[PDB]
């Protein structure tokens, strides 16, 4: 492939460099339309800019935490972090979010990796070996109420059991209700006067509940869960302007008030170098 | 003697002529078309009013003055009240449509000024409150009036800050969306053909707008000496290939 | 039972590896795809669309005005604007090009810089745009500027001029984050003759300026952007 | 070799090697030729 | 292959052993040009002197250390070794360095092995099990500021998570900007009067940041990281004189003052055996 | 699931072993090679060039 | 001995995965099947039989 | 596979929607027996409702 | 590839792709045609 | 068998078995024959 062809002096009536940008086109002008060039080859394919590659590496999408401790006398397991749920999202930690929102609709399978590490912040004789249970709870399933409910039987709901310190990995097909996930949605769920704007089920990817299977030892053990997400089989439509201001909320476009100028001011003139 | 410059668009019972065009944009290089069976889901036969809905509606005019910040209309909202297009809209459960948008602004060879005319698929607005405040329905359904970016923040309304496109992105990059400029010195109209763009084959016309049309002054209007300091901008829009499905009782929407 | 040996790296999680995994939802059938206009396949497809450069960066809060390069009637010989070419920083940084370049470590290729004139139709002007390849200072006067890559632009019916910064380089890749060894030059613009307004007209006229990449362009070695960060996880 | 039955479980896809910027860079209705005048 | 051919008495006008070294050549003289030889075969190929073999074994290129401890009240994580970076180099530990600098330009893929072991120098009830995170931070990426910054999300930057006591292994393609890495560079980054000499980006191989993912236990744990580097697919040009004096700095050729004579003095005469 | 048995040596790191590894930079394209005079392939090539001997070591 | 590398997820138990296992009862012979009317193959077969709706829910 | 065929107005002596449930059958009535439909395809096989799948986790 | 000798040890079965609701939805002795009168 | 997609991930290269010291041992412009006089 040639990156530049050889081209010499020109004295024409045919001027490729004068255009009318009002038309909305970006005319494909090249170095050889306005200087004299020599042949050179590309030596490159643009492999690593493919959208499959761009969205295809694992990104941290969620960090939560649960603890193993005596539940005796706990009136609210959920509240003691005896167990914890997470409604899956890709817009809570901003790194991956800005990447996805370069597109309007996106379609892909997900590969999840879940790393779990334990901490024992206060005096323990040892490090126990805990098994985590991660249950995938689709909308309409009974939700766990205690850390050892009938729910955890999970007879119809996919669940994975792995050890703290290890990693669990499985992949979920594209679960969207429509043909693509909406990265944006300028609508409501119905014509209600007060219903929420922008947040939609069109994006919904399920939800996940974590708990330790082990009963309690004498000390307490903090287990912190990190969920990583990798898109595989990516398809993206309609590019948009990149995110400039900071994010404030999952699912709305809102930016913070009295934010700071995002364009760097010159130290000098327009004329400055 | 054909120029890129003169054009005629006849759609239904209405025709537009421009003698100072700058080509026309067809979003994503695709022209509006009906919904193919292979893509269909709802089993209902659809209704295609054709020429009674696919004609040109001219919205009320705006006034560009030296202080203007820009205006924003949503589709199909802007047309919610135009003739039979609008009736069909409130009466069917689902509908689908593409449009021809023609924005008009003429001046003289002594004026200067340049407007950006852009179509943004799925333009989800931001609340000026920040945090996770929502933007109420009425605020994103201004109707033919559209939203005036130089109007004041209101409560439950969107933010109207132009350098941020009403969503946290910079004005400068709106050029990645199908768009055309109106530069008084060149141009006097902008025309964009919009194919139907959605993640579902057909949708509700009232709970979801699928494009915002935005006209934004970028190089300020500058009139000749002792000229009146303003020009009107007119927007005429025509639904094209419209289909309605799931007819019934007639939606009632807030406000 | 087949005898195996495990190698160093067993059990590691590399966020960039690509392997098979069990599906949690065995036998599930995804929604059919329907057609949607606009599919993107390569980021190289989109960085060829031009977007506006806030060249007039001299303001103090972001404003529509930093996209406008002003022009003065009747000045002769003088300089319209200047900038270095660190596409990952400074004016370029918020543009779509700048914004994507920042997802990669290295770039190579030609850039296309165009200027669209917005002055009254009955005015006229001749400007010179000059690209100064690495190795010399930003030009200080047109004489200096005109000895490097340049285009005399004659403002006419055809409203925009497209200047190309041809890839001039020893090393075949440069860093997107500004680096010296790897630096690309300067871009300046001067009056060639001068802007002239018709009667009954007055004041400043402005140029809009765009940037996009030529088909020439290469970007490689993906990394994280300095353009976005956060202090606590967001919630709904 | 796929070891698993479902398609979601396969590795990353392989390069589009599609690439056609014209839907984004030249969505004009009447074709523009480089070198010919923009507005006739 | 014959190592020596058979050759007998000679009384010629053709003298292969008289040459003129001023010419710059090393004339290919053999035993059989000056004594009577018998046939013998080589029995050898020179396999283990191939440059791929010479540069192809893992060498320790870096030892760093980080600790897991309560960051509460630490004003400078980087400074507490709460996390640590390393800008990749092959010229800090001298063994591999002398080997590479036998050549001027070198081109190869790298295979890294990272061994991490833990130490608990002061009273602990137990040994905890820590997971290390090694992030590859290319120039221009945000750099970690705390041990748990958004940076560590590493949504676009390759990172590996492995356990202390284990090893991590991955391989990076040749990331040089030019066609080869310069082992030497007699230049500057620009014609500045005070810019640094010799050190160049032409050599730059990225940079790496390490941290423990675990929160803190009651005791403190020292984790010491050793990075090993193996060249694979080696290509080397222009041999040079081997390094004689000791090294003082990464990237400069400088040797220490009042160094010692590097040539061993005879214990005796020139005539001595 | 195929039945396996691991042998002695599993998990060891031998600095001299030669195996495959995942690439950290999937799909990256290295700079083209250009021609450079002087390529060395074997150390046996270079030890045939003669160099001076500090024979007079007595200093 | 063939060189291997284990990936993330090793040792996990996913209630939805489908693999082979050793039989605890090697060589056992199950009872022959006889014919029984009524075999169901898909839940989609049965949701097409209509059943009564307690529409008058007001009790 | 078609999920619905195209069907238009009807004015017949052949009424598929009147039945006698006392018989114990569930007559296979479709949308196209009582409204005008357009063609649409199933795009689906009913894989995940197989009893092997239902009892197999 | 089965690694084991017994049939119980193989993975899950594969979709019936049988599907015939008529034993449940139309177990009538004399065949009913849709469109013809239910009771003659 | 390569298990991985990228070339960097393959094992060590295989012996040049190239070997030609003359660029280093005899870079003279006019060819010298062993046995013939060095300087004529």
Swiss-Prot record, chain H:
What does the UniProt entry say about where the protein is found? Virion; Host cytoplasm
List the cysteine pairs that form cystine: none
Q: Which residues form a coiled coil?
A: none
Function of the protein: Forms an icosahedral capsid of pseudo T=3 symmetry with capsid proteins VP2 and VP3. The capsid is 300 Angstroms in diameter, composed of 60 copies of each capsid protein and enclosing the viral positive strand RNA genome. Capsid protein VP1 mainly forms the vertices of the capsid. Capsid protein VP1 interacts with host ICAM1 to provide virion attachment to target host cells. This attachment induces virion internalization. Tyrosine kinases are probably involved in the entry process. After binding to its receptor, the capsid undergoes conformational changes.
Q: How does it assemble?
A: Interacts with capsid protein VP0, and capsid protein VP3 to form heterotrimeric protomers. Five protomers subsequently associate to form pentamers which serve as building blocks for the capsid. Interacts with capsid protein VP2, capsid protein VP3 and capsid protein VP4 following cleavage of capsid protein VP0. Interacts with host ICAM1.
Protein name in UniProt = Capsid protein VP1
